């Protein structure tokens, strides 16, 4: 006999697994090298084969698809599939009999024909329902322990059986019995991670090819655009997106308020447009998990307007700092402080500076999540964030509204002390070797921080000014453009007399409040407001 171990009519393309391919190459190299090679060389070498494969990873990836495909790829006895904990039975000693029934046939075949038999595949799905720790599973009955012991004794006992392949997949590997996770049993273990950009492109092509073939897909569709937009989608979500888009297109030809009807004409004219894809992205499907999903639209609701010189100066300084921290050896840690009068946009400029930087790891720590936290929880949250930041090669973090992060209030003073000591030490310590860290701080009250003796721990400070000249006020108004030229001249005629001191966050409020009155009283009302509230140096 010259039985082959691979189906001659096989191709890696038809398997359709997408971005795993390096994982699949590793699996093949380890699991089947011993069998592909011709007999005499291995006979001389006398190398045993591996028996147990363990696949693990988060929900919705290849794993079941991959196991179904591996089972299909070989040309041998059909696999026997076990769907989770269907082994358990209500009589004493009925579980072990069931388990051994699986391997009985392989034992017999090996014993009869010797070393020239075929291959048998046993696929354990949801293996964590069975092989939980015998030292941890509930003490109410033996059966879980005796099942584990039966499996361990049978997979690699005193009698040597070396013609069986057992495949396992799970979600929480660390619970599995370590005596099962040792060479010669379940030995190769691999992580099926979330797909990268290229993998997304592959998956999309695989699911779109058939529709392409018949010219149902409209030519405007740009797959690469879709790939770029879709961040953290898994394979399952990537399929569901396409399904939802097709459904949105197909529904267009059905009536269903009165008794259902379908147009036998337009049934011939169906196509999917890119607009359906856009629509499905926001209404129907949402990606779970993922890292980022930042709502910068909530931190920077109005973008920026370059109402004068200082905005550019500030942004230039921030860019310089980023560039420096990018390429340096002596000083792997850099810390910058932003401060100025209240209502001056201190947060928006910080967030924009961060976003222009293109570091892989960008996170903002803010008190708005921490409402009612004790003096302990805050420490935990901060420690967690910085631990995360230390993993990635490059990381930039923003700590905003320090004064509210301390619970400061002027009557005592009163503040939390633990938080301040944690903040000082976390600012001081250097990151792990070869990584680099940037920290951007925001505060309203410089002098207080100076008093607490933490101003020194920052490397440098940046001053964010507010509007100082009436000319700048006029320019900011023009950039907003909420008033007509005649109103502009009317304002100018009086405003030019004296300088003004007002922060832009208050400017917007005043404008909005002024718009509410009748047209003939707007200007005057505005003026009155600017007069009454603007009294300040």
């Amino acid at each position: 006999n010259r039985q082959s171990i691979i189906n001659p009519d096989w191709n890696f393309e038809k398997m359709g697994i997408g971005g795993l391919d390096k994982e699949f190459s590793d699996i093949f190299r380890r699991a089947f090298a011993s069998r592909v090679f011709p007999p005499e060389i291995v006979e001389q070498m006398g190398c045993k084969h591996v028996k147990g494969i363990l696949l693990y990873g988060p929900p919705g990836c290849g794993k079941t698809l991959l196991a179904r495909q591996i089972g299909k790829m070989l040309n041998a006895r059909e696999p026997k599939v076990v769907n989770g904990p269907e082994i358990l039975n209500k009589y004493v000693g009925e579980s072990e009999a069931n388990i051994r029934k699986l391997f009985a046939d392989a034992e017999e075949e090996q014993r009869r024909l010797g070393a020239n038999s075929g291959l048998h595949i046993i696929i354990f799905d949801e293996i964590d329902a069975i092989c939980k720790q015998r030292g941890s599973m509930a003490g109410s009955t033996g059966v879980h322990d005796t099942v584990v012991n039966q499996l361990l004794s049978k997979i690699d006992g005193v009698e040597q059986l070396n013609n069986i392949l057992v495949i396992g997949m799970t979600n929480r590997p660390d619970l599995i019995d370590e005596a099962l996770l040792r060479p010669g049993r379940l030995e190769v273990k691999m992580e099926i991670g979330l797909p990268d950009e290229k993998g997304r492109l592959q998956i999309l092509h695989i699911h779109t090819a058939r529709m392409r073939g018949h010219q149902l897909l409209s030519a405007d569709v740009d797959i690469k655009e879709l790939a770029v937009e879709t961040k953290n989608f898994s394979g399952a979500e990537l399929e569901g997106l396409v399904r939802a888009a097709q459904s949105t297109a197909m529904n267009r030809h059905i009536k269903a308020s009165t008794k259902v009807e379908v147009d036998m004409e337009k049934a011939e004219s169906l196509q999917v447009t890119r607009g359906d894809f856009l629509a499905s992205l926001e209404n129907d499907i949402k990606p779970a998990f993922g890292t980022n999903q930042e709502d910068y639209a909530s931190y920077i609701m109005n973008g920026i307007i370059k109402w004068g010189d200082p905005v550019t100066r500030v942004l230039d300084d921030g860019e310089l700092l980023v560039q420096q921290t990018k390429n340096s050896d002596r000083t792997p840690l850099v810390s910058v402080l932003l401060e100025g009068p209240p209502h001056s946009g201190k947060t928006a400029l910080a967030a924009k500076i961060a976003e222009e930087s293109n570091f892989p790891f960008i996170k903002i720590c803010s008190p708005d999540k921490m409402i009612g936290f004790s003096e302990t929880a805050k420490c935990q949250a901060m420690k967690k964030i910085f631990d995360d930041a230390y993993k990635s090669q490059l990381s930039c973090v923003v700590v905003d509204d320090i004064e509210r992060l301390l619970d400061y209030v002027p009557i005592g003073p009163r503040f939390s002390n633990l938080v301040l000591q944690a903040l000082l030490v976390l600012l001081k310590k250097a990151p792990p070797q070869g990584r680099k860290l940037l920290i951007i701080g925001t505060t309203s009250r410089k002098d207080v921080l100076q008093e607490m003796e933490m101003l020194n721990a920052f490397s440098t400070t940046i001053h964010v000014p507010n509007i100082a000249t009436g000319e700048q006020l006029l320019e900011a108004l023009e950039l907003l453009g909420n008033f007509k030229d005649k109103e502009r001249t009317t304002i100018a005629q009086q405003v030019k007399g004296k300088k003004v001191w007002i922060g832009i966050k208050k400017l917007l409020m005043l404008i909005e409040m002024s718009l509410q009155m009748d047209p003939e009283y707007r200007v005057r009302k505005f003026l009155a407001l600017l007069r009454e509230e603007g009294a300040s140096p």
Binding site: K90, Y91, S140
Partner: protein, 37 residues
């Protein structure tokens, strides 16, 4: 005071014998017919 608990349960079977009552009745039966005849 610790919480209060609940159990699963497991059952087993028994065999029984078959033949003695008929070994007896058969050794009994086949002679009263002769007597009556």
């Amino acid at each position: 005071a610790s919480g209060i608990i609940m159990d699963s349960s497991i059952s087993k079977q028994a065999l029984s014998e078959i033949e003695t009552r008929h070994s007896e009745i058969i050794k009994l039966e086949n002679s009263i017919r002769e007597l009556h005849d």
